[PDB]
Design a protein around this ligand. Structure first.
Ligand code: CLA
Ligand code: CLA
Ligand code: CLA
Ligand code: CLA
Ligand code: CLA
Ligand code: CLA
Ligand code: CLA
Ligand code: CLA
Ligand SMILES: CC1=CCCC(C)(C)[C@H]1/C=C/C(C)=C/C=C/C(C)=C/C=C/C=C(C)/C=C/C=C(C)/C=C/C1=C(C)CCCC1(C)C
Ligand SMILES: CC1=CCCC(C)(C)[C@H]1/C=C/C(C)=C/C=C/C(C)=C/C=C/C=C(C)/C=C/C=C(C)/C=C/C1=C(C)CCCC1(C)C
Ligand SMILES: CC1=C(C/C=C(\C)CCC[C@H](C)CCC[C@H](C)CCCC(C)C)C(=O)c2ccccc2C1=O
Lengths: 139, 107, 80, 34, 732, 30, 90, 161
């Protein structure tokens, strides 16, 4: 499951759009995927890179940069074998996406609903009733 | 620049009424107007104008005269484009009237 | 973080989940609608507040509602 | 003017030292974790 | 990480946004973390003591700097010829031409000439020397300290008032009407009778002798006999020289009407009798409400009983008492609306009926005071509507207000907004149409084709008060009318002289230019009201954002969906109406100032002929009067109007800088700031220095506020420089 | 005219007002 | 949001009937409608007479005529109280 | 006369307006020969200026101190041709335009594609409507009393509050 750090990266000539000091002191994100070919893609941070046949690995500063590349590869090259990780400066690696092996738009058992409100949006509480009270406006 | 260029040389445009250069005198004011009118589109946002249009639509609904092409406030991009077009028209038009009345009178 | 709510008018069209750029939303099972599924927001710490989910939703007033709240490095979209 | 030395004493202090001191101490106060 | 101590959401922001938002939300105590209502009302009480102390320190400072550096004693000898000094200048950036150029006032040092009118005010109320100005400054310094101490004391645990005290409306109303309004009006009548009027008649009265010097020769015996009319006998003659004994009478309570002929100001005995009568009426007003002894009215009962039986107002005012007492924003909106109307009355009634001796001959002071109080009025009037919007969002409860006047307002809000939209368009189309018509017709050489409407309704109102200029012969103008005959014994002889001399600003003559500008002012008032009312009534919800109340008062937008929702918050309607308030006060003060400077030359016909088209306003007001201002420095030298000449340009700069925040928006600036963050991290010798807070672009709402502040500041500074320098340079 | 000693009396009372202003501000700040 | 205090003796004054309850008259709750109607007519005539006697106001007026002129606005409130009591059966 | 104004036929400043306006044209005419097109044009302007001033003098207009005609709009019948009668003419035309446009919008609602009728106008039907507007006060008032002008409050969409 865990990120094999030794995976070769896509060939790239470098750019100024990559990650900065906050990546090595706050968090960095990684994306891995399998390619059937040695083909050109566009980096979220800049110009063009070439993905190597087999397994690829990138490091990006934002999670959204990892997911923007993931949508681009899925539509352009029909690759869905992408895994997104969060990596902390302690060395600890956090698997992120897809979170339980199944993509979020496909249903899965054992997913518990978070954020679900039992009434429609117009049935919320007016601000005055919950003033100087800790009670939430969602009913 | 304020005194010896704009103020001193705007004498011919602002004193032009009743002459053949009174057209430049009118276009000077008209472009000053259009320029100011552009800032209504540049400083405002679409959501205010859509909610104002809702109350005007209500008054048309009351008299059974609502249109079948439902009125909308202009898009965010079109609001920017209308503001920029009227800004450019008013600023350039004011310079055009000032330059032409000044140099026709003195040159 | 931002706070994202899903109200029970959700028809289970999955459009918000496909539109979300930061994997905040996912689909869970629910017998309330014809599609048998409702959106859920388990990962709101990653919500940047783009409101692309709200644009995607087709119910009359949005079943998904994003409430912009406290700002973080994640919700500010800062790569520095 | 009576006590005419006072503007030449107080105006540099009020106009330079007083803002330099409040900027320095406000900067320290707003950037402390505790 | 701990500056916004009142907000844990801001104190954990890692950007520069934390500093900005923590400073801008500091006084909104209702939103601070862990705020109860008890603690909210006690902090408001103490910070009201701190504000009162700030006002007393400002007044003591003005008195001190005039006592120390001014020429009050030289001005008091010859008030029409000497120019009052505000304070001295010590600026080490000055050159010797600047030091010499500002050395006016009859003194040996550079000085600012005061436009505040405080010399005329302190002279009229009794002050004659520098030492009693200094005594007054030390008294206000002491009072400022006393109110600072009172604020600190009422935050101490035994002296913290309870919520039941803060919401005892009946007692507060009784004490504020009979003591704060009524008794202090009666005491100010006492000051005028005992000090100001004797010193207007040459006799010094101070704390050293005021118990042995009677204000009246008879002396408090006619009052205790019912012979009150003995205090009106022998008023000041029309030959009275203010400050001296020549021509002086002995009356202390008169109703002469009109102006003192030499000071061109209202009689001091009229002002003293005014404050006596106001004091008695307000003290009577302050016995209306029941406190502890069983007489008086319950406010709750009066509001509950005023439901018209025809049912046109629904449930009437039932439940309004609870909402007003609980809501501080409703209280703020009522107080600010009420205060805004008064400061507009202050501006209108002090130029037409001046009370200070030798004022109205100082044109710069009259222009500055009118402009100042009309701008304060426009700000107060905007704030009243802003806090009414905050009331509806935050404090309004629809279940305690079922079928009220408030709920029925929200039930026909669309009708009010649509009608306001109609009246604004009806005024705007035709006022702009008549102005543009006149412009084209004058430009084509044919001014006799102009549409010139005579303002007959206002001229008829002037004639009803006795103006004999339009031949209307109605009421007071008619010599044999019930109105004229009723007041023939008292006010009518003096008032008729005042209103029918063409040498003051009491009921100024009007024509077609006054008609057109009054209609423009009406359009501006309706449009500013439309944005503020639409903002208050759509604050809770609309069709674009029906759940707008869940998001608050100030939020950026709801995003690009549903067509786009920029500027959808109620705060954004405050923002949009601020431009229209500035436009409205602009049209009002431009009108006042042009009409007054043309009258002050003796060339009222220049306003009469040029005000009916817009080129007359452009060349004969802005362009013509700009020339002394923009020549304050030039390549040939400088004079004392150089500072206003600089402030004028300063005002043009800030205003234009505001455009940058209002036209260009966040996404552009955030991408620039990201290229600068990269450059700092990659530059050697500079990347040794690191930010504690991540540099980000300003927020959407913050940038709207920053652009509004820059716009407004540029507006104020530019107009202040023009109105002071043009009046000073012209002197007329 | 005003003597310098009178100016010094004004500065003493304004200093007392500054001390009371700090104490009120600290009470308000908590 | 917290209990709003009102003075002791505050009662319910909301009415949806033809006339308000007699409690809206305060201390005049027990006066009959005939007595308000006659007092209203009396106060209107005396107030109008005293007002008429001092319409040319002078520096020395009769003080009693001044005080008696205040009966004209007071008579308006008196006839409103007469209508309230007559429609309450008093 | 009214409001201290002077009838334009005897105000001397109106006479100076006419004289200065004609001298301004005559000094331009002094630079041209008799039968030339600029001379003919300026003489036509001089005649037009004189005609306008003469007509205004005999019309009952009231000039001010400036000598420019002023309009009285308080409602008196001696001055009804300056605001009240032009206003009656305006309200007839404006009510015509409103009645005719409302009639076309109600026709277009009953069409196959209602929004195609408003960008591509049915010109014979729209001309049928433009002709009907001459009796708009009676048609619109009968429309009102028959309960067909005003719609009830519960068939109108409103905001939540
Ligand atoms: C609100 C009141 C006020 C204001 C705006 C001013 C303004 C000024 N004073 Mg000051 N002054 C005041 C009250 C005030 N005075 C009082 C009450 C005294 C008597 C103790 C003095 C005594 C005084 C002296 C002795 C001198 C000045 C001078 C000056 C000038 C230069 C600034 C300076 O050196 O400050 C110095 C001012 C002080 C040391 C006095 C303390 C200032 C007050 C009491 C504090 C006010 C705080 C305010 C309410 C809130 C500020 C916070 C703000 C961010 C909201 C400037 C015109 C100088 C001058 O004449 O230069 C030409 C100078 O030498 N002043
Ligand atoms: C608010 C009041 C204020 C006051 C009293 C002064 C005072 C002065 N400025 Mg000005 N200045 C100000 C605001 C002020 N500045 C602002 C807001 C700006 C930005 C627009 C400027 C920009 C400015 C420029 C660009 C220049 C001055 C100069 C000067 C000096 C006058 C010229 C002279 O005689 O040279 C004699 C001056 C000296 C011999 C040098 C004085 C050095 C001081 C006394 C050392 C003090 C140590 C330092 C303050 C430690 C403080 C730490 C912190 C707590 C403040 C004088 C020191 C000129 C200057 O620097 O002169 C060299 C100059 O070139 N000023
Ligand atoms: C006596 C008058 C009075 C009082 C007590 C208040 C008090 C308040 N107003 Mg109101 N307001 C007023 C006049 C007043 N205002 C006027 C005259 C205007 C028109 C310009 C406004 C326009 C206005 C708006 C539009 C807003 C406020 C807000 C606020 C609150 C926070 C202020 C803050 O944090 O800034 C403190 C700023 C600094 C310390 C930096 C300088 C506070 C309850 C804001 C709020 O929080 O509303 C919920 C808000 O959005 N007010
Ligand atoms: C000179 C500048 C200017 C002008 C004319 C206007 C005009 C108007 N504003 Mg705007 N506004 C401005 C600046 C300006 N604003 C600025 C800077 C702000 C701050 C952001 C605002 C903010 C603002 C708000 C927030 C609101 C307004 C409203 C209004 C209306 C109020 C007056 C009225 O109802 O009837 C006056 C009508 C007119 C002046 C229209 C002019 C008639 C035209 C020019 C006809 C000419 C047709 C011509 C043949 C076309 C030629 C086209 C060519 C291609 C052939 C009106 C449309 C309010 C509104 O919409 O009320 C309903 C409203 O809610 N304005
Ligand atoms: C909604 C429109 C509107 C508004 C806000 C105002 C506002 C004002 N007018 Mg203006 N006025 C208007 C319409 C309006 N007027 C019209 C249509 C006329 C007739 C030409 C006038 C004629 C007029 C005169 C002569 C004077 C004012 C003056 C004033 C000021 C004082 C108040 C007053 O006299 O009210 C006037 C209010 C009305 C006349 C009520 C108008 C209400 C209706 C709905 C407007 C439409 C009527 C309609 C088109 C006419 C019907 C048809 C008829 C021709 C047969 C104030 C600025 C006075 C002033 O101080 O000038 C300096 C003044 O002397 N007005
Ligand atoms: C339009 C104004 C108005 C009206 C309708 C009333 C009406 C009333 N007042 Mg109020 N009152 C007013 C103004 C008014 N007052 C003012 C201005 C004052 C201040 C002097 C008072 C002070 C006052 C007191 C102190 C008392 C009343 C009382 C009364 C009631 C007496 C009925 C009566 O005399 O029976 C015959 C009646 C409900 C009495 C009462 O019972 O109140 C509930 C009472 O004790 N009035
Ligand atoms: C601001 C309020 C106001 C209003 C609403 C009016 C309204 C009117 N005035 Mg005006 N008037 C005003 C103020 C006002 N006036 C003032 C302040 C003066 C100066 C004293 C005048 C002086 C004045 C004169 C001198 C006359 C009017 C007349 C009229 C009426 C003629 C309109 C009409 O066609 O009706 C009447 C016609 C029909 C109903 C049907 C006609 C088809 C009309 C009711 C005229 C009139 O007839 O008086 C009633 C008239 O002769 N007015
Ligand atoms: C013929 C159609 C028609 C009718 C009957 C009305 C009727 C009304 N409008 Mg609406 N309106 C229309 C078209 C129409 N409008 C159009 C095309 C626009 C877009 C410019 C608007 C924009 C508009 C606004 C912004 C406002 C109104 C308002 C009003 C009301 C008061 C009168 C007024 O203010 O006029 C104002 C008229 C205009 C601003 C524009 C009219 C433009 C032309 C002259 C009319 C349309 C001609 C149309 C093409 C007819 C073709 C007929 C043919 C097919 C046979 C009234 C309910 C006001 C309101 O709600 O008051 C309560 C208001 O504030 N209207
Ligand atoms: C906005 C604000 C913020 C927070 C909330 C708030 C508190 C309510 C509010 C209030 C702010 C307020 C009210 C601020 C008030 C600020 C004030 C009143 C500041 C006064 C300063 C006076 C000084 C430094 C004079 C010192 C004189 C000296 C040392 C002379 C001494 C001497 C001389 C030479 C001669 C005599 C002998 C000696 C003694 C030797
Ligand atoms: C937004 C909002 C939401 C809900 C809460 C909220 C805060 C309450 C609200 C704010 C509302 C606001 C901000 C409301 C602002 C309301 C204002 C400014 C109301 C102005 C009222 C002025 C009046 C009635 C003048 C009357 C003069 C008269 C009768 C003179 C008469 C005359 C006399 C005697 C002498 C001359 C002759 C004549 C002419 C005969
Ligand atoms: C006034 C205004 C509107 C409302 C403006 C509208 C609805 C335009 C409607 C005007 C009429 C309907 C057409 C205008 C025709 C004119 C006579 C000129 C025509 C110019 C050519 C297009 C023909 C917005 O939608 C808006 C959106 C975003 C930022 C600012 C604003 C803004 O300021």
């Amino acid at each position: 499951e865990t990120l094999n750090l030794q995976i070769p990266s896509p060939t790239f000539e470098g750019s100024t759009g990559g990650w900065l000091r906050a990546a090595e002191v706050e968090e960095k994100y990684a994306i891995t995927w399998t390619s059937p070919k040695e083909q050109v893609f566009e980096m979220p941070t800049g110009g063009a890179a070439i993905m190597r046949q087999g397994e690829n690995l990138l490091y990006l500063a934002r999670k959204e940069q990892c997911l923007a590349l993931a949508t681009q590869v899925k539509n352009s090259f029909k690759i869905t074998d992408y895994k997104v990780y969060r990596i902390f400066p302690s060395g600890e690696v956090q698997y992120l996406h897809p979170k339980d092996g199944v993509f979020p738009e496909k249903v899965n058992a054992g997913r518990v609903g978070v954020g679900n409100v039992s009434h429609s949006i117009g049935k919320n509480l007016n601000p005055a009733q919950i003033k100087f009270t800790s009670k939430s406006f969602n009913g | 620049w304020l005194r010896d260029f704009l103020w001193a040389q705007a004498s011919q445009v602002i004193q032009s009424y009743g002459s053949a250069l009174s057209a430049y005198g009118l276009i000077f004011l008209g472009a000053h107007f259009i320029w100011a009118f552009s800032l209504m589109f540049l400083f405002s946002g679409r959501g205010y104008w859509q909610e104002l249009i809702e109350s005007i639509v209500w008054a048309h609904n009351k008299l059974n005269v609502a249109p079948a092409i439902q009125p909308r406030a202009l898009s965010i991009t079109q609001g920017r484009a209308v503001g920029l077009a009227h800004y450019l028209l008013g600023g350039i038009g004011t310079t055009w009237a000032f330059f032409l009345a000044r140099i026709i009178s003195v040159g | 973080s931002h706070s994202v709510k899903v109200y029970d008018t959700c028809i289970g069209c999955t459009q918000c989940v496909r539109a979300c750029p930061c994997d905040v939303l996912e689909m869970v099972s629910w017998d309330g609608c014809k599609a048998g599924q409702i959106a859920s927001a388990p990962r709101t710490e990653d919500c940047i507040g783009c409101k692309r989910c709200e644009t995607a939703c087709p119910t009359d007033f949005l079943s998904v509602r994003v409430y912009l709240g406290g700002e973080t490095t994640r919700s500010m979209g800062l790569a520095y | 003017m009576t006590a005419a030395y006072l503007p030449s004493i107080l105006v540099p202090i009020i106009g330079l030292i007083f803002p330099g001191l409040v900027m320095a101490f406000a900067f320290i106060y707003i950037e402390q974790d505790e | 990480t701990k500056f916004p101590k009142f907000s844990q959401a801001l104190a954990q922001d890692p950007a520069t946004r934390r500093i900005w938002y923590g400073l801008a939300t500091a006084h909104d105590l209702e939103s601070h973390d862990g705020m109860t209502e008890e603690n909210l009302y006690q902090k408001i009480f103490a910070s009201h003591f701190g504000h009162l102390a700030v006002i007393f320190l400002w007044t003591s400072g003005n008195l001190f700097h005039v006592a120390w550096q001014g020429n009050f004693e030289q001005w008091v000898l010859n008030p029409l010829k000497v120019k009052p000094i505000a304070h001295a200048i010590w600026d080490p950036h000055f050159g010797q031409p600047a030091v010499k150029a500002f050395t006016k006032g009859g003194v040996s040092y550079p000085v600012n000439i005061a436009t505040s009118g405080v010399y005329h005010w302190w002279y009229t109320i009794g002050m004659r020397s520098n030492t009693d100005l200094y005594a007054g400054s030390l008294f206000l310094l002491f009072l400022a300290g006393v109110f600072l101490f009172a604020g600190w004391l009422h935050l101490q645990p035994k002296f913290r008032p309870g919520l039941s005290w803060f919401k005892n409306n009946e007692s507060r109303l009784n004490h504020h009407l009979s003591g704060l309004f009524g008794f202090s009006s009666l005491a100010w009548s006492a000051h005028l009778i005992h000090v100001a009027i004797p010193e207007a008649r040459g006799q010094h009265v101070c704390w050293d002798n005021f118990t042995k010097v009677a204000p009246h020769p008879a002396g408090l015996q006619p009052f205790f006999t019912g012979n009150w009319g003995a205090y009106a006998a022998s008023p000041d003659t029309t030959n009275h020289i203010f400050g001296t004994s020549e021509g002086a009478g002995t009356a202390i309570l008169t109703f002469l009407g009109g102006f003192h002929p030499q000071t061109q100001a209202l009689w001091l005995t009229d002002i003293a009798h005014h404050h006596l009568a106001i004091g008695v009426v307000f003290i009577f007003a302050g016995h209306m409400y029941r406190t502890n002894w069983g007489i008086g009215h319950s406010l709750k009962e009066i509001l509950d009983a005023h439901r018209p039986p025809g049912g046109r107002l629904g449930a009437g005012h039932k439940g309004i008492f609870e909402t007003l007492t609980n809501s501080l924003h409703f209280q703020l909106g009522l107080a600010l609306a009420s205060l805004g109307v008064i400061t507009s009355l202050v501006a209108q009634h002090m130029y037409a009926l001046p009370s200070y001796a030798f004022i109205a001959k100082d044109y710069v002071t009259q222009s500055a005071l009118y402009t100042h109080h009309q701008y304060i009025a426009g700000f107060l009037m905007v704030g009243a509507f802003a806090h009414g919007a905050i009331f509806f969002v935050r404090d309004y409860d629809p279940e305690q207000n079922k079928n009220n006047v408030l709920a029925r307002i929200l039930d026909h809000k669309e009708a009010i907004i649509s009608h306001l939209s109609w009246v604004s368009l009806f005024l705007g189309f035709h006022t702009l149409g008549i102005y543009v018509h006149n412009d084209v017709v004058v430009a084509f050489g044919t001014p006799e084709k102009q549409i010139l409407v005579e303002p007959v309704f206002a001229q008829w109102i002037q004639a009803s008060s006795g103006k004999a200029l339009y031949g209307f012969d109605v009421l007071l103008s008619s010599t044999n009318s019930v109105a004229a005959n009723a007041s023939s014994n008292i006010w009518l002889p003096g008032w008729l002289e005042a209103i029918n001399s063409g040498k003051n600003s009491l009921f100024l003559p009007i024509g077609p230019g006054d008609f057109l500008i009054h209609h423009a002012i009406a359009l501006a008032l309706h449009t500013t009201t439309l944005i503020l009312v639409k903002g208050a009534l759509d604050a809770r919800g609309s069709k674009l954002m029906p759940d707008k109340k869940d998001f608050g008062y100030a939020f950026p937008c709801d995003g690009p969906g549903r067509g786009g929702t920029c500027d959808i918050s109620a705060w954004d309607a405050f923002y949009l109406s601020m431009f229209w308030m500035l436009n409205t006060i602009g049209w009002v003060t431009f009108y006042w100032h042009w009409k007054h400077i043309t009258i002050w030359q003796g060339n009222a016909g220049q306003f009469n002929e040029s005000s009916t088209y817009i080129m007359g306003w452009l060349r004969d007001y802005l362009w013509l009067n700009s020339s002394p201002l923009i020549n304050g420095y030039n390549p040939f030298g400088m004079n004392s109007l150089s500072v206003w000449s600089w402030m004028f340009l300063f005002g043009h700069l800030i205003w234009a800088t505001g455009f940058m925040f209002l036209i260009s928006w966040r996404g552009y600036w955030q991408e620039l700031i990201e290229t600068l963050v990269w450059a700092h991290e990659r530059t050697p010798l500079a990347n040794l220095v690191r930010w504690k807070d991540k540099p980000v672009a300003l927020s959407i709402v913050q940038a709207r506020l920053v652009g509004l502040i820059h716009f407004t500041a540029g507006y104020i500074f530019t107009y202040a420089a023009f109105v002071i320098a043009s009046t000073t340079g012209k002197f007329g | 005219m005003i003597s310098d000693t009178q100016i010094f009396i004004a500065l003493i009372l304004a200093l007392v007002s500054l001390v009371l202003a700090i104490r009120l501000g600290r009470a308000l700040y908590q | 949001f917290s209990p709003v205090p009102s003075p002791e003796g505050t009662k319910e004054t909301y009415w949806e009937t033809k006339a308000p309850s007699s409690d809206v008259l305060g201390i005049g709750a027990g006066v009959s409608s005939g007595n308000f109607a006659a007092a209203s007519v009396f106060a209107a005539l005396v107030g109008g007479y005293c007002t008429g006697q001092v319409i040319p106001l002078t520096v020395e007026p009769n003080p009693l005529f001044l005080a008696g002129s205040f009966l004209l606005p007071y008579s308006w409130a008196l006839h409103v109280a007469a209508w309230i009591q007559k429609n309450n059966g008093k | 006369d009214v409001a201290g104004l002077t009838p334009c036929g005897e105000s001397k400043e109106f006479a100076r307006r006419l004289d200065g306006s004609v001298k301004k044209l005559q000094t331009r005419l002094s630079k041209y020969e008799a039968g030339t097109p600029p001379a003919l044009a300026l003489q036509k302007q001089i005649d037009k200026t004189k005609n306008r001033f003469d007509r205004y003098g005999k019309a009952g207009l009231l000039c001010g101190t400036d000598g420019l005609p002023h309009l009285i709009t308080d409602g008196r019948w001696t001055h009804s041709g300056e605001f009240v009668i032009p206003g009656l003419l305006f309200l007839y035309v404006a009510g015509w335009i409103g009645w005719v446009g409302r009639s076309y919008v109600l026709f277009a609602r009953t069409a196959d594609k209602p929004t195609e009728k408003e960008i591509i106008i049915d010109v014979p039907v729209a001309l049928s409507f433009v002709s009907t507007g001459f009796i708009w006060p009676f048609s619109a008032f009968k429309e009102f009393t028959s309960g067909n002008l005003i719609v009830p409050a519960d068939e109108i969409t409103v905001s939540p509050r």
